[PDB]
PDB file of C-alpha atoms in Angstrom:
ATOM      1  CA  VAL A   1     122.826  97.949  89.341  1.00 21.95           C
ATOM      2  CA  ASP A   2     122.193 101.644  89.590  1.00 24.02           C
ATOM      3  CA  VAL A   3     122.829 103.974  92.690  1.00 23.71           C
ATOM      4  CA  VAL A   4     120.203 107.037  93.552  1.00 23.96           C
ATOM      5  CA  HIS A   5     122.428 108.607  96.125  1.00 25.96           C
ATOM      6  CA  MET A   6     125.590 108.276  97.894  1.00 26.35           C
ATOM      7  CA  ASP A   7     126.257 111.038 100.825  1.00 26.58           C
ATOM      8  CA  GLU A   8     128.395 109.444 103.505  1.00 27.41           C
ATOM      9  CA  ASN A   9     126.517 107.144 105.722  1.00 25.59           C
ATOM     10  CA  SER A  10     123.729 106.449 102.715  1.00 25.15           C
ATOM     11  CA  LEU A  11     123.331 104.669  99.487  1.00 27.97           C
ATOM     12  CA  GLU A  12     120.374 103.950  97.430  1.00 25.73           C
ATOM     13  CA  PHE A  13     121.091 101.894  94.663  1.00 28.21           C
ATOM     14  CA  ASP A  14     118.643 100.090  92.545  1.00 30.26           C
ATOM     15  CA  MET A  15     119.777  96.317  92.088  1.00 32.09           C
ATOM     16  CA  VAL A  16     117.500  95.347  88.869  1.00 30.13           C
ATOM     17  CA  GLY A  17     116.802  91.991  87.897  1.00 29.70           C
ATOM     18  CA  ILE A  18     117.216  89.850  91.359  1.00 31.25           C
ATOM     19  CA  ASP A  19     115.013  87.420  92.909  1.00 28.91           C
ATOM     20  CA  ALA A  20     113.337  88.194  96.311  1.00 30.86           C
ATOM     21  CA  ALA A  21     115.521  85.401  97.699  1.00 31.49           C
ATOM     22  CA  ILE A  22     118.849  87.100  96.753  1.00 32.13           C
ATOM     23  CA  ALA A  23     117.815  90.594  97.857  1.00 31.75           C
ATOM     24  CA  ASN A  24     116.618  89.219 101.093  1.00 30.48           C
ATOM     25  CA  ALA A  25     119.696  87.256 101.461  1.00 34.64           C
ATOM     26  CA  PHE A  26     121.968  90.682 100.973  1.00 35.15           C
ATOM     27  CA  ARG A  27     119.574  92.588 103.623  1.00 36.50           C
ATOM     28  CA  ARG A  28     119.748  90.003 106.190  1.00 32.12           C
ATOM     29  CA  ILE A  29     123.739  89.831 105.940  1.00 35.15           C
ATOM     30  CA  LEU A  30     124.230  93.722 106.301  1.00 34.28           C
ATOM     31  CA  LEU A  31     121.891  93.701 109.539  1.00 35.10           C
ATOM     32  CA  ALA A  32     123.211  90.828 111.151  1.00 33.60           C
ATOM     33  CA  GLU A  33     126.310  89.115 109.566  1.00 34.08           C
ATOM     34  CA  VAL A  34     128.722  92.008 108.471  1.00 31.19           C
ATOM     35  CA  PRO A  35     131.237  92.203 111.457  1.00 31.02           C
ATOM     36  CA  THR A  36     131.882  95.298 113.724  1.00 30.96           C
ATOM     37  CA  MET A  37     134.056  96.201 116.746  1.00 33.03           C
ATOM     38  CA  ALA A  38     132.065  97.126 120.074  1.00 31.36           C
ATOM     39  CA  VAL A  39     132.648  97.394 123.790  1.00 31.80           C
ATOM     40  CA  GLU A  40     132.403  93.978 125.282  1.00 32.67           C
ATOM     41  CA  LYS A  41     133.838  94.379 128.866  1.00 33.94           C
ATOM     42  CA  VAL A  42     133.880  96.903 131.142  1.00 33.21           C
ATOM     43  CA  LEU A  43     136.359  97.515 134.145  1.00 34.25           C
ATOM     44  CA  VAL A  44     135.053  99.892 136.639  1.00 34.74           C
ATOM     45  CA  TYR A  45     137.988 101.145 139.273  1.00 39.08           C
ATOM     46  CA  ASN A  46     135.389 103.911 140.859  1.00 44.28           C
ATOM     47  CA  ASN A  47     132.135 105.152 140.123  1.00 41.47           C
ATOM     48  CA  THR A  48     130.357 107.470 142.308  1.00 39.54           C
ATOM     49  CA  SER A  49     127.895 108.568 139.480  1.00 40.50           C
TER      50      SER A  49
ATOM     51  CA  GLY B   1      43.316 141.152 191.823  1.00 40.18           C
ATOM     52  CA  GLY B   2      44.893 137.661 190.206  1.00 37.42           C
ATOM     53  CA  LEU B   3      45.409 136.641 186.706  1.00 35.09           C
ATOM     54  CA  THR B   4      42.493 134.938 184.936  1.00 36.39           C
ATOM     55  CA  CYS B   5      42.032 132.940 181.668  1.00 34.94           C
ATOM     56  CA  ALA B   6      41.022 135.868 179.071  1.00 34.44           C
ATOM     57  CA  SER B   7      38.784 134.917 175.681  1.00 33.51           C
ATOM     58  CA  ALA B   8      40.296 132.695 173.358  1.00 31.46           C
ATOM     59  CA  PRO B   9      42.339 134.098 170.444  1.00 32.37           C
ATOM     60  CA  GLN B  10      40.354 134.604 167.160  1.00 32.36           C
ATOM     61  CA  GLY B  11      43.484 133.927 165.055  1.00 31.77           C
ATOM     62  CA  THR B  12      47.081 133.264 164.595  1.00 32.78           C
ATOM     63  CA  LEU B  13      49.884 135.204 162.657  1.00 35.00           C
ATOM     64  CA  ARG B  14      53.321 133.407 161.849  1.00 36.26           C
ATOM     65  CA  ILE B  15      55.782 135.500 160.718  1.00 38.55           C
ATOM     66  CA  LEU B  16      58.843 134.608 158.845  1.00 37.71           C
ATOM     67  CA  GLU B  17      61.516 136.654 156.686  1.00 38.18           C
ATOM     68  CA  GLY B  18      61.771 135.484 152.813  1.00 35.78           C
ATOM     69  CA  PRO B  19      63.474 136.533 149.781  1.00 35.78           C
ATOM     70  CA  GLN B  20      62.402 136.155 146.016  1.00 36.18           C
ATOM     71  CA  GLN B  21      63.554 134.176 142.928  1.00 37.39           C
ATOM     72  CA  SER B  22      65.126 135.814 140.060  1.00 37.39           C
ATOM     73  CA  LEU B  23      64.851 135.005 136.136  1.00 37.55           C
ATOM     74  CA  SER B  24      66.155 131.428 135.054  1.00 37.59           C
ATOM     75  CA  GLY B  25      68.892 132.255 132.817  1.00 36.43           C
ATOM     76  CA  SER B  26      70.728 128.694 133.492  1.00 40.64           C
ATOM     77  CA  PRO B  27      74.246 129.946 132.449  1.00 41.53           C
ATOM     78  CA  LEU B  28      75.857 126.590 132.592  1.00 45.65           C
ATOM     79  CA  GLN B  29      79.708 126.793 131.969  1.00 43.97           C
ATOM     80  CA  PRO B  30      82.228 129.336 131.517  1.00 41.70           C
ATOM     81  CA  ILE B  31      83.922 127.791 128.394  1.00 41.17           C
ATOM     82  CA  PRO B  32      80.938 125.329 127.690  1.00 41.65           C
ATOM     83  CA  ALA B  33      80.248 121.708 126.326  1.00 43.44           C
ATOM     84  CA  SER B  34      83.127 119.635 125.663  1.00 47.07           C
ATOM     85  CA  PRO B  35      85.191 121.213 123.043  1.00 45.52           C
ATOM     86  CA  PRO B  36      86.388 118.875 120.093  1.00 42.43           C
ATOM     87  CA  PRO B  37      90.037 117.921 119.377  1.00 42.99           C
ATOM     88  CA  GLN B  38      91.145 119.138 115.868  1.00 42.56           C
ATOM     89  CA  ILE B  39      93.176 119.495 112.947  1.00 42.33           C
ATOM     90  CA  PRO B  40      96.856 121.538 113.284  1.00 41.37           C
ATOM     91  CA  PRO B  41      96.423 123.629 109.903  1.00 43.78           C
ATOM     92  CA  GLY B  42      98.523 122.632 106.780  1.00 44.30           C
ATOM     93  CA  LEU B  43     100.525 120.277 109.078  1.00 45.83           C
ATOM     94  CA  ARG B  44     102.473 118.705 105.988  1.00 47.05           C
ATOM     95  CA  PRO B  45     104.085 115.133 105.522  1.00 45.40           C
ATOM     96  CA  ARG B  46     107.068 114.719 108.021  1.00 46.99           C
ATOM     97  CA  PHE B  47     108.312 111.491 106.117  1.00 45.75           C
ATOM     98  CA  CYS B  48     109.297 110.571 102.529  1.00 46.19           C
ATOM     99  CA  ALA B  49     110.046 107.313 100.594  1.00 44.98           C
ATOM    100  CA  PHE B  50     113.905 106.295  99.774  1.00 44.04           C
ATOM    101  CA  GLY B  51     114.561 106.810  95.930  1.00 43.73           C
TER     102      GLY B  51
END
């Protein structure tokens, strides 16, 4: 593994010597399976906007 | 002493007022034709690959 850049909010490693199935598994995990926190419910007391 | 029919007229004149034609110049349009859409100069790529 070789990393071309690592600012904050960016990474560009290489990952030399792995198949397309494992690379695709890693890519699909980041997009859809790594957990995050986000607003689910909103209680609106007044809203004259 | 009355009015009597006189000799028949020998001719008729019909008058009308008419102006004339100018030269044919045929100036079709201020900015004429359909001017073509075209390239902005230089432009430059606005995108790069990663790595």
